[PDB]
Amino acid sequence: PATVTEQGEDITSKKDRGVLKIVKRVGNGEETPMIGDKVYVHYKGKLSNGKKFDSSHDRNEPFVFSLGKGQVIKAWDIGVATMKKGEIAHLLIKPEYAYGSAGSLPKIPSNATLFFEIELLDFKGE
Ligand SMILES: COc1ccc(CC[C@H]2OC(=O)[C@@H]3CCCCN3C(=O)[C@@H](C3CCCCC3)c3cc(OC)c(c(OC)c3)OCCOC/C=C\COc3cccc2c3)cc1OC
Numbered sequence: 780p781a782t783v784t785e786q787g788e789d790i791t792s793k794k795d796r797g798v799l800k801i802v803k804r805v806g807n808g809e810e811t812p813m814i815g816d817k818v819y820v821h822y823k824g825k826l827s828n829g830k831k832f833d834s835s836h837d838r839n840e841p842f843v844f845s846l847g848k849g850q851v852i853k854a855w856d857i858g859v860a861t862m863k864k865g866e867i868a869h870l871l872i873k874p875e876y877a878y879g880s881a882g883s884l885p886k887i888p889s890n891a892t893l894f895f896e897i898e899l900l901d902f903k904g905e
Pocket residue numbers: 822824825826830831832833842849850851852853855877878883886887893894
């Protein structure tokens with residue numbers, strides 16, 4: 780997470796560093812998911828300080844959602860939108876792009892900075 784702080788690319792339209800990304804593994808894909816595409820990922824998630832660890836692997840199930848429909852935090856609609864199939868991205872997220880000053884307790888404290896390792900398994904339209 781500190782690495783992303785230093786090295787991570789800004790992928791916010793507004794470029795406020797609210798969302799930062801390192802492409803760790805390059806995908807075989809040439810396409811990215813469109814808004815309204817059903818998205819299939821593996822993911823690991825923690826607060827910046829390593830607390831509240833969560834993963835699709837542990838839940839024995841991929842995390843499936845439709846892109847750009849606010850099913851997930853702003854940071855995910857922005858971040859997975861940049862990703863290619865087979866790609867693994869690292870994300871460091873400002874609370875403004877996650878749960879904000881209100882947070883979401885008990886899991887998400889007030890003004891929490893999140894870290895995600897996401898693997899984009901696939902995406903489909905229709
Ligand atoms: C439009 O804005 C929102 C959209 C959706 C939500 C609800 C939470 C949502 O989760 C997320 O947005 C992100 C990104 C997708 C992976 C999960 N996630 C989380 O933030 C994680 C959180 C990662 C950081 C360590 C603590 C757990 C994360 C993981 C959680 O448990 C797996 C979690 C949670 O809620 C605070 C956040 O618990 C609530 C869900 O209980 C279990 C049920 C379903 C599985 O979790 C889901 C399902 C769908 C969406 C999410 C969780 C709040 C939003 O407000 C900003």
